[PDB]
Design an enzyme around this catalytic site. Structure first.
Site, PDB file in Angstrom:
ATOM      1  N   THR J   1     -10.249  61.945   8.426  1.00 45.24           N
ATOM      2  CA  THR J   1     -10.769  62.686   7.241  1.00 45.24           C
ATOM      3  C   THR J   1     -11.134  64.121   7.621  1.00 45.24           C
ATOM      4  O   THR J   1     -11.798  64.356   8.632  1.00 45.24           O
ATOM      5  CB  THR J   1     -11.997  61.980   6.623  1.00 45.24           C
ATOM      6  OG1 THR J   1     -11.715  60.588   6.440  1.00 45.24           O
ATOM      7  CG2 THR J   1     -12.364  62.597   5.276  1.00 45.24           C
ATOM      8  N   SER J   2     -10.677  65.072   6.810  1.00 51.84           N
ATOM      9  CA  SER J   2     -11.012  66.483   6.980  1.00 51.84           C
ATOM     10  C   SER J   2     -11.415  67.091   5.642  1.00 51.84           C
ATOM     11  O   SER J   2     -10.567  67.343   4.781  1.00 51.84           O
ATOM     12  CB  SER J   2      -9.837  67.252   7.586  1.00 51.84           C
ATOM     13  OG  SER J   2      -9.613  66.863   8.928  1.00 51.84           O
ATOM     14  N   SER J 129     -13.878  63.369  10.518  1.00 51.25           N
ATOM     15  CA  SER J 129     -13.463  63.248  11.916  1.00 51.25           C
ATOM     16  C   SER J 129     -12.686  64.471  12.404  1.00 51.25           C
ATOM     17  O   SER J 129     -12.798  64.861  13.567  1.00 51.25           O
ATOM     18  CB  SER J 129     -12.633  61.978  12.122  1.00 51.25           C
ATOM     19  OG  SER J 129     -11.495  61.968  11.277  1.00 51.25           O
ATOM     20  N   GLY J 130     -11.908  65.072  11.505  1.00 44.71           N
ATOM     21  CA  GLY J 130     -11.081  66.230  11.838  1.00 44.71           C
ATOM     22  C   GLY J 130     -11.822  67.553  11.908  1.00 44.71           C
ATOM     23  O   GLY J 130     -11.285  68.540  12.415  1.00 44.71           O
ATOM     24  N   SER J 169      -6.689  62.382   9.905  1.00 39.74           N
ATOM     25  CA  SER J 169      -6.418  63.353   8.849  1.00 39.74           C
ATOM     26  C   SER J 169      -4.920  63.575   8.680  1.00 39.74           C
ATOM     27  O   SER J 169      -4.154  63.442   9.637  1.00 39.74           O
ATOM     28  CB  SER J 169      -7.110  64.681   9.156  1.00 39.74           C
ATOM     29  OG  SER J 169      -8.501  64.495   9.340  1.00 39.74           O
TER      30      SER J 169
END
Ligand SMILES: *[C@@](O)([C@H](Cc1ccccc1)NC(C)=O)[C@@]1(C)CO1
Lengths: 222, 204, 198, 196, 233, 222, 125, 212, 198, 196
Positions: J1-2, J129-130, J169
């Site tokens: 996820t970004s 996370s990104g 991502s």
């Protein structure tokens, strides 16, 4: 942590006749829910009129068959090309299996052939070495489905003569090579219907005094 | 550890030509120890038959529960319970205890009194309806029963012929199971009559 | 676990229960009566968890006696055993279950026949000619399967239990300090005071 | 830990922070993570301080024995010795080593060796806990054949951001320049790089 | 006993009428981080064999070193090293299969899934799989990791059994491989757009293709999708 | 289990396999995985079979009551919202993985729901053990503005990929078509590519084979 | 380390090291043994070259291997103790595994077996 | 698995069942559980099938090697200790075996030795090993006398297995009988429990609770 | 654990050892002699792990008998007990230790005095007037601390052990099937065959 | 996820990738992580998909009830409702939510809510996370009061780098623009942002 073992599925079947012996097995190789191969040979001719199949962990199965075939080769070198008898092969495999007692081959191995009297012989092995000569044996994933069927149809268990009030059992009139193949094919189709790891194709290796013959049949690919 | 493997036992159901058959072993045990050879697993409420496997305390409880519920049903509806409707009653009763389930394998067998249709059904411990036209199996020798029924069964068997099929499927499966056996009983269900037969088998 | 044995003969139900109470390292008592009278013609023996075993037995005793006063009537051995089974079935799924194994030994006055019931802590009832709980059956059942007849007298039943106890006193590692033997028939419940050297 | 090595027009520059931590306490704020294994072959050290020191000492021993017999070793040769120790003893070692050296024929070369013990020849490499925060910056700002002035600025701006976001990184930015002219030591203090 | 640190994803392969096709992407994953992009995961041995490895990259480089030593060892005291006594794909696989099984038996495995693709001296196609467990199997189509779940179903549509092999041309087989690589880039989180492809033919020989990219991607339908249920804008 | 959902120009189509398994053993060879929330909203279940059946019937019951209260046709977003909020409350303990699709006064809709209560919206979706095999076909052959017949072919091909390649799936293909202005057509056993071949032998026992100890008539009539 | 072949064949077919070992026996004091109907008697002679010995503590020529077996010898006194010790250990090992004391034939077979081993092993005489 | 061996006037009676089980699955109903060490010695099998089958056959090799060496018949005490000492070397490794080594020598007479995987070696008159050993002891202890005839002693061993096969879920299949004399063991047939149960039930009057 | 008792009186050492061998669920033997004669005037009783208990006892027996032949001399009870202690001390830090508890009951012919030694599996030697291993001491020691005198006769020592066994047969839950009693004095080692009802 | 949200001259723009993964398999490659809770108040979602969807649905409910009684809520008010659910149910939730909305008086506002349940008002915020890989890039390239053209480019370049390095991502870059003019949906495909 690394697990050295795996389950490649499959099911093998060995039935001994009066003067013949068959060793069948499905050609399906699997991992979890995926099919590795639809045609992967499992029953092998090892020489000296002996057929072998070690079902379970394929890497352990291939290693055991490879090591036994080599043991037959050296038996010819050491003992002036003497034919390895089916009872001698059975005892040899025990020592091959028990040699790795504390790190066992994760397989159910079955051998088929003829004894020194010309009669059909089937030996079933424990993963660690224990062996016994049996009339018929199913090994592997669908072994619990095939074995009760064989007791009823080959050994005529729970069957009695009609009109005797269950006092006279059905006589042990033993089957021909044509009749055994019928039971083998019906066992594997029933195994394919109810077990997910059995299917694709069936390969039967028939052993007589003439030699080893091979037969192939299609199974459901679902 | 497994509550469905403490007591042992098996139930099998089959359809035929205008008839159904349901069979069970008589063994009740505590692990390796054999306790009783008279523990019947088939019960009936009117013309609808129910076979229960698994934990024996739940087998008795559910039998008393379904007798409780079918009796109240009969008083309100002014008619006997039907196999299709009872199947839904079992399913909803089992799912009511979703997070605290009865450790059982119920099997419904019977013929609809209005249509004359042969009906069998299967359930897991939480109440999933397994409606098969051929056979329903349950118990500690379920694998053994699946292999027997898939090989022996053929569609549209006569009551006398279906009896031979279900009896041989039960006996040879029970002989390959340590927790099953110690006698067997078969019911032959028809539109008008039901025949109960005790089978002679191994006692080990 | 404690020794709990039961046998149904021609006209009576005989129950044999061990006298020993062991806690940890010492035998605290060698004359404990592991049975309760539920009604004039119904007796229940018990074994299991230290506290639960007596608490459950007295709870059942109180309920049966309450029924006997309310209806001025004695419940049948079948009706009592079904009541006990349901209580143990309710207990198994509660916060803290009763870990008690029971044997119901009763004489039905209406049927004029003795009846023996075996119920474990899970709530598993079974009517039996002979019954045992725990490891007791492992040593005794083979002797019972061999000698038992339905037309046996009370004297014959006592001789068979004597043989069962002798096998327990030889092969079983635990010292259960003998057994208290009680007879349940048409006249009520009596205790065999002479079983130590019968 | 924030370590990097960048190849450029005239050779290669190795950069590192000076923070070694035991939990949340900084045991050493003036650490030298840029270790010499040969005259014009250096390495950046991340992971276990004990492991990386022991490996670099063995490599320096191997390259010294190599020089006595066969002459000046290549950067690839030095990276192979590092790899041999890291790969074969992977179960007992926690080491992330960047190997960078200058050759007269091969110019500047960078080899990264992650935890497993593999070799990766790259134009530039970033390693350590603080390197995660500058993957985006370094990929967008790196060019091939940069000047000495630009490469110092690239490593200075990259490690300053790595220090800013990572708690395990900090102190001063140390640099070692490897060219034909020789070996040059560079240092940059918090008062300079924090305000970039 | 170990754990994989730097990993390579799927290696997919199939056999056609005249030979075999094998492909793998150029990624070296460090957990969730897509760290390295210049990693060749297809190792050509001679002019008749290509070895595709997935899993641990450090173990892959070790295998790569073993294969180079095998070529050097085979050429020792061998005047027919480039003729009759050249390395067959069957010799290369069996060696690796022996090593893979020995390592797992010592409880220190090479954390890899390997597919050996090539054409034998008689012209026969060779395609066999071996993993960290030492499990070996042959199939018309072979794929590792995510390829086994996604690429295999697509490749088996072209070649379902042994009789379909002589019916499949190079153009059709390669198209199926390129399509499978696109599908893997869609649904595998540890995949790369850049990939290598190798064709081993009994007539045209070894054809190694580098720097291939996934093209013709469908993404246009994404603009019409908004929210997760009830949202309209 | 393999379940798919495909959107076309004037509606939505869902498809499923018919294999129900208890571990490696097939329990039902022809089960219904296509459930009905309401006349025009249909659901495909994966995971815990008892959970998927009950959560469909519970929300379906509430949808029927809502439809009668509001005097309006059931909406897909309504069935979706009630399913996700129920599944979220139980924190994934109810193992229901569903593909919900249907037509209503607002148009055609396609959604997928996980056990924890998360929802996804797309034109093509797949869930179950054969999801990856199905998605592979969907990612290869899907195009925008599909016709009715093209959508049936695409969904059925995706399910077949689950049958042949995934061990958790097999037997038949069930399809349900939902068009904007028409009634939903549920096609039970749309394809049957896994018909069991005839047995090699008939196992019909002669009457009097099984020994009987006691025989009696059971009383049904009160 | 030392494995030099000391006991070897000669052109005429004799092992000289074994042959000269018999010459050491010929030098040793005379030992005689006779068996009756119900008893066996062993007799040995004592040296008279030096006479001032303490007969209590001086190792006797007849040694007990077990409670039922005795051993007398002729030759090197130092070499005999090795054979006596090994025979005594074997006597106890036999009682431990076979649960029965040695037969005289077995104990003789063992002692002769040890002696034979030293006639074809490298580095020993 | 139920295995017994008792000592009496006419020698030794060895009686075993033939069932093999892995969990709830019955693997076989016709498994040999007596290893014929040699024409004179016998060994029962309980616990791990491979451990018992391998080492007791290995014992036959050691017994033959002893008789060639000493030119005399091996005693039961010596034979049993060969297996006992070997097992003790493997103690803790995971071997699972419980066996009775039976033989009739001139030096000892009839002799039973209980050897297990823990390394226990016990000489005794009566032994039962297995999951159904407790059921075998009941019938055996109550009917055992030293002055039993060969016919009655063979029946008692047969009856003791039947009682255990009935009650123990893991025991069953068929009964194998052996009678050990000084000149060697004599095999007394294989008796199917399924057929034996009804035969004994009618003739003896036992197993009243079972309906037949 | 098994019952291993020892008492040293005026002119002899008396050892009492239980006859029961229990494995899991059954008592396999009720006449087991848990003692070995190391030398004519030295006796050792033993209890502990199933296999280790006899293997260690026979190992010591072989070594003492090897010494007796080599030197034509009997080792003193002290010298034997010190040898046993060191063997158990070496074992405790090995790959797989001997889990054996021993009592050395010997009569010194040079000193003309009886001696009793107690060594556990760890290698803890102690010279005692009376000793016990495991749980045996918990029931017996209070009776021994009360009645024991150094000038007691052999007959008096047998009466005190009888009282010790009676306490064990009453309070301890395990049935140890009685005890074998052996006397070690100047004349050697003899077994009391009449202790069942002495 | 970004995910990210950046305030600028005319308002605020929210940006997100479209990848949701179950392990290493991409279950959805066209996910919309930009969720509306009010006309001109939106949120970015990271962490548990089931949690973030359930929270956003409750917030949308609360803000709808707020508007019926009190009128259009502020961005701070919406961030407060998000926080109240996140903080009080912290043991059962895994949610990283960026709250960004437009006001006529307050212009553009960004509030980040990490795992614990705290509120942080920022000029711009990155999460998921990104986001770890672009901390260096965003800190060096972000300027205050950028134009719409500049802000779109800033988010496009940031998320492209975030997608490049992070496996979790991927897919398409979705953008929602919040100004006085209204709400604008923007989308950028892999063929564009990968070659930046
Ligand atoms: C018994 O102990 C079995 C089977 C067995 C077969 C052959 C030789 C010895 C034993 N052993 C195992 C492993 O359980 C029974 C039938 C109770 O399992």
């Amino acid at each position: 942590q690394f697990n050295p073992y795996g389950d490649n599925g499959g099911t093998i079947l060995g039935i001994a006749g009066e003067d013949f012996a068959v060793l069948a097995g499905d050609t399906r190789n699997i991992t979890d829910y995926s099919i590795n191969s639809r045609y992967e040979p499992k029953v092998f001719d090892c020489g000296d009129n002996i057929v072998m199949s070690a079902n379970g962990f394929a890497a352990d199965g291939d290693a055991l068959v490879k090591r036994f075939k080599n043991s037959v080769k050296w038996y010819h070198f050491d003992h002036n090309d003497k034919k390895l008898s089916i009872n001698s092969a059975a005892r040899n495999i025990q020592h091959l299996l028990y040699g790795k007692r504390f790190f066992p081959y994760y397989v159910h191995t079955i051998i088929a052939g003829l004894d020194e009297d010309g009669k059909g012989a089937v030996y079933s092995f424990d993963p660690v070495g224990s062996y016994e000569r049996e009339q018929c044996r199913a090994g592997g994933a669908a072994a619990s489905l095939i074995m009760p069927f064989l007791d009823n149809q080959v050994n005529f268990k729970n069957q009695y003569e009609p009109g005797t009030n269950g006092k006279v059992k059905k006589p042990l009139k033993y089957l021909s090579v044509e009749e055994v193949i019928k039971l083998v094919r019906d066992s594997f189709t029933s195994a394919t219907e109810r077990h997910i790891q059995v299917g694709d194709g069936l390969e039967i290796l028939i052993v007589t005094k003439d030699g080893v013959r091979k037969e192939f049949y299609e199974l459901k690919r679902d | 550890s497994d509550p469905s493997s403490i007591n042992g036992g098996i139930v099998v159901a089959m359809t035929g030509k205008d008839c159904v058959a349901i069979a069970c072993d008589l063994r009740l045990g505590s692990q390796s120890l054999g306790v009783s050879n008279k523990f019947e697993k088939i019960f009936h409420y009117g013309h609808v038959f129910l076979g229960i496997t698994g934990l024996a305390t739940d087998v008795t409880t559910l039998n008393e529960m379904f007798r409780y519920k079918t009796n109240l049903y009969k008083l309100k509806e002014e008619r006997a319970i039907e196999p299709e409707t009872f199947t839904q009653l079992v399913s909803s009763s089992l799912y009511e205890r979703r997070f605290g389930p009865y450790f059982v394998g119920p099997v419904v067998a019977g013929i609809n009194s209005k249509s004359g249709k042969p009906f069998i059904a299967g359930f897991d411990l939480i109440g999933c309806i397994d409606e098969a036209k051929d056979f329903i199996v349950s118990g500690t020798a379920s694998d053994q029963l699946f292999g027997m029924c898939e090989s022996l069964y053929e569609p549209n068997l006569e009551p006398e012929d279906l009896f031979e099929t279900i009896s041989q499927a039960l006996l040879n499966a029970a002989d390959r199971d340590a927790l099953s056996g110690w006698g067997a009983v078969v019911y032959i269900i028809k539109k008008d009559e039901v025949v109960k037969r005790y089978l002679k088998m191994r006692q080990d | 676990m404690d020794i709990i044995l039961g046998i149904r003969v021609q006209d009576s139900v005989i129950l044999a229960s061990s006298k020993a109470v062991t806690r940890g390292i010492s035998v605290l008592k060698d004359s404990d009566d592991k049975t309760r009278q539920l009604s004039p013609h119904t007796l229940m023996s018990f074994a299991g968890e230290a506290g639960d075993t007596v608490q459950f037995a007295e709870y059942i005793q109180a309920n049966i006696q309450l029924y006997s006063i309310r209806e001025d009537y004695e419940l049948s051995p079948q009706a009592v055993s079904s009541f006990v089974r349901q209580e143990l079935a309710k207990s198994i799924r509660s916060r803290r279950p009763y870990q008690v194994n029971v044997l119901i030994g009763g004489y039905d006055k209406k049927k004029n026949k003795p009846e023996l019931y075996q119920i474990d802590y899970l709530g598993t009832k079974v009517e039996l000619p002979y019954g045992a709980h725990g490891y007791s059956g492992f040593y005794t059942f083979s002797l019972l399967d061999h000698h038992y007849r339905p037309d046996m007298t009370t004297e014959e039943g006592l001789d068979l239990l004597k043989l069962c106890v002798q096998e327990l006193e030889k092969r079983m590692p635990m010292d259960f300090k003998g057994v208290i033997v009680k007879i349940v028939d048409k006249d009520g419940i009596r205790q065999v005071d002479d079983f130590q050297a019968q | 830990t924030s370590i990097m090595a960048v190849t450029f027009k005239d050779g290669v520059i190795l950069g590192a922070d000076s923070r070694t931590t035991t939990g949340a306490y900084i045991a050493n704020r003036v650490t030298d993570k840029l270790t010499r294994v040969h005259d014009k072959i250096w390495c950046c050290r991340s992971g276990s301080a004990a492991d990386t020191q022991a490996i670099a000492d063995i490599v320096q021993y191997h390259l010294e024995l190599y020089t006595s017999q066969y002459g000046t070793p290549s950067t690839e040769t030095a990276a192979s010795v590092f790899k041999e120790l890291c790969y074969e003893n992977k179960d007992n070692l926690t080491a992330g080593i960047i190997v960078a050296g200058y050759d007269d024929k091969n110019k500047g070369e960078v080899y990264t060796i992650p935890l497993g013990g593999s070799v990766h020849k790259l134009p530039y490499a970033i390693a350590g806990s603080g390197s995660t925060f500058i993957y985006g910056y370094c990929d967008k700002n790196f060019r091939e054949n940069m000047s000495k002035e630009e490469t110092v600025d690239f490593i200075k701006h990259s490690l300053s951001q790595a220090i800013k976001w990572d708690g395990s990184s900090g102190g001063v930015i140390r640099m070692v320049v490897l060219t034909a002219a020789g070996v040059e030591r560079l240092i940059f203090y918090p008062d300079e790089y924090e305000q970039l | 006993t170990q754990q994989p640190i730097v990993t390579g994803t799927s290696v997919i392969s199939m056999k056609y009428d005249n030979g075999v096709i094998i492909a793998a992407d150029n990624l070296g994953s460090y957990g969730s981080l897509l760290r390295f992009n210049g990693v060749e995961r297809l190792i050509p041995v001679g002019d008749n064999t290509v070895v595709g490895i997935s899993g641990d990259i450090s173990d892959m480089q070790h295998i790569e070193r073993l294969l180079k030593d095998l070529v050097t060892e085979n050429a020792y005291d061998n005047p027919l090293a480039d003729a009759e006594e050249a390395l067959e794909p069957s010799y290369i696989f069996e060696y690796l299969a022996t090593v893979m099984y020995q390592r797992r038996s010592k409880m220190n495995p090479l954390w890899n899934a390997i597919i050996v693709a090539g054409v034998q001296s008689n012209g026969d196609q060779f395609l066999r799989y071996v993993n960290l467990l030492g499990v070996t199997y042959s199939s018309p189509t072979l794929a590792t990791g995510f390829g086994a779940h996604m690429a295999n179903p697509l490749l088996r549509k072209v070649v379902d059994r042994e009789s379909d092999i002589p019916k499949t041309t190079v153009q059709v087989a390669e198209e199926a491989i390129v399509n499978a690589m696109r599908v893997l880039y869609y649904r595998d989180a540890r995949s790369s757009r850049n990939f290598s492809l190798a064709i081993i033919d009994k007539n045209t020989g070894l054809t190694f293709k580098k720097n291939l990219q996934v093209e013709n991607m469908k993404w246009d339908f994404a603009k019409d999708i908004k929210g997760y249920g009830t949202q309209k804008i | 289990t393999t379940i798919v959902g495909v959107k076309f120009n004037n509606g939505v189509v869902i498809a499923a396999d018919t294999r129900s398994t208890q571990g490696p053993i097939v329990a039902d060879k022809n089960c219904a995985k296509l459930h009905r929330i309401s006349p025009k909203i249909w659901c495909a279940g994966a995971g815990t079979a008892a959970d998927t059946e009950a959560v469909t019937q519970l929300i379906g019951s509430n949808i029927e009551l809502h439809s009668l209260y509001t005097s309006r046709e059931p909406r897909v977003v309504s069935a979706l919202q009630m399913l996700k909020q129920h599944l979220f409350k139980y924190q994934g303990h109810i193992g229901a993985y569903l593909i919900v699709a249907g037509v209503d006064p607002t148009g055609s809709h396609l959604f997928s729901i996980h056990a924890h209560g998360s929802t996804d919206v797309g034109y093509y979706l797949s869930l179950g053990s054969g999801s990856l095999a199905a998605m592979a076909v969907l990612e290869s052959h899907w195009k925008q503005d599909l016709t009715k017949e093209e959508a049936i072919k695409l969904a059925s091909d995706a399910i077949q990929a689950g049958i042949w390649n995934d061990l958790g799936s097999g037997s038949n293909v069930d399809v349900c078509v939902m068009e904007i202005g028409k009634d939903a057509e549920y096609l039970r056993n749309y394809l049957t590519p896994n018909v069991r071949e005839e047995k090699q032998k008939s196992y019909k026992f002669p009457r009097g084979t099984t020994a009987v100890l006691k025989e009696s008539i059971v009383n049904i009539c009160d | 380390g030392y494995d030099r072949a000391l006991s070897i064949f000669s052109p005429d077919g004799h092992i000289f090291q074994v042959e000269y070992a018999l010459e050491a026996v010929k030098r040793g004091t005379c030992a005689v043994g006779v068996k009756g109907k119900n008893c066996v008697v062993l007799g040995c002679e004592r040296r008279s070259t030096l006479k001032l010995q303490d007969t209590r503590i001086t190792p006797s020529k007849v040694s007990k291997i077990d409670s039922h077996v005795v051993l007398s010898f002729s030759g090197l006194n130092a070499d005999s103790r090795i054979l006596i010790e090994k025979a005594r250990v074997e006597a106890q090992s036999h009682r431990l595994t076979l649960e029965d004391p040695v037969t005289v034939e077995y104990l003789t077979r063992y002692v002769a077996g040890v002696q034979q081993r030293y006639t074809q092993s490298g580095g020993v005489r | 698995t139920t295995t017994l061996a008792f000592r009496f006037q006419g020698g030794i009676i060895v009686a075993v069942d033939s069932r093999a089980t892995a969990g709830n699955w019955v693997a076989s109903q016709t498994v040999k559980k007596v290893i014929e060490i040699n024409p004179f010695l016998l060994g029962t099998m309980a616990g791990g099938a491979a451990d018992c089958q391998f080492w007791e056959t290995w014992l036959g090799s050691q017994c033959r090697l002893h008789e060639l060496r000493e030119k005399e018949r091996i005693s039961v005490a010596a034979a049993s200790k060969i297996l006992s000492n070997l097992v003790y070397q493997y103690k803790g490794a995971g071997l699972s075996m419980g066996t009775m080594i039976c033989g009739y020598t001139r030096k000892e007479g009839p002799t039973i030795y209980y050897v297990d995987s823990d390394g226990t070696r016990l000489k005794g008159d009566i032994f039962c090993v297995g999951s159904g050993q407790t059921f075998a002891y009941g019938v055996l202890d109550s009917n055992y006398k030293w002055d039993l005839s060969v016919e009655d002693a063979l029946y008692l061993g047969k009856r003791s297995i039947l009682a255990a096969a009935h009650r123990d879920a893991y025991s069953g299949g068929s009964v194998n009988l052996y009678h050990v004399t000084e000149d060697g063991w004599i095999y007394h047939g294989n008796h199917d429990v399924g057929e034996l149960f009804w035969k004994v039930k009618e003739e003896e009057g036992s197993f009243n609770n079972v309906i037949g």
